[PDB]
Amino acid sequence: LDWTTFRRVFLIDDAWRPLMEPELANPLTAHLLAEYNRRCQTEEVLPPREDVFSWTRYCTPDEVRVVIIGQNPYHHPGQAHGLAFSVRANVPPPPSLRNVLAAVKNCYPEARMSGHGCLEKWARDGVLLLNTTLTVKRGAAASHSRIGWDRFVGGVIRRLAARRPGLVFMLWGTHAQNAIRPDPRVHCVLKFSNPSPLSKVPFGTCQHFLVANRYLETRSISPIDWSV
């Protein structure tokens, strides 16, 4: 597994090399990539290839201030673009994203919200929106959850966390909470129910956005402007 080749294939930004290159030495990464490629040859896999690692482009590893974990990408064309929860700018926010934006609006009654659900602005500001499974077969939710992305992604998050003391993690729902278990004494770990529409627990009362900024300030880190 060669870094230059891998980087070129997925248009990965090079600032992430120290965090991702080590993952290429894990024998299981080769298996993951061969299976991902096998899937792309036999299915309409989403998001498009050039977007699978869009999260490496919006900000560098040292700019990450908050990590929000997702599960699987949207499986309808035109929705997913490589970031957890986010959808392309011309797509009315699906239920889970609508729920997240509503909590944001409840936390910040004055925020000037655009009404769209493209979280590129958050990503550029260092809010890492990462799915534990990066791809999916069109029309079949979570269809790629067993191909190996979760270990690769978890590895990257682990290296990022060791490199960076003081991160805020927002772990929403069971799956997110089981996949990433950051040292609570080194990082601010915030848990909540799932913004997924299947949850019968309202996501609207989530105050993580406010809690996160108070934490960042105690660590002399600039707060996040959550408007979007």
Ligand SMILES: OC[C@H]1O[C@@](CO)(O[C@H]2O[C@H](CO)[C@@H](O)[C@H](O)[C@H]2O)[C@@H](O)[C@@H]1O
């Ligand atoms: O439902 C109206 C409106 O309420 C919001 C804001 O809290 O979310 C609630 O309702 C959803 C179902 O429509 C739930 O899935 C969600 O958990 C709950 O907080 C908005 O998201 C929604 O537009």
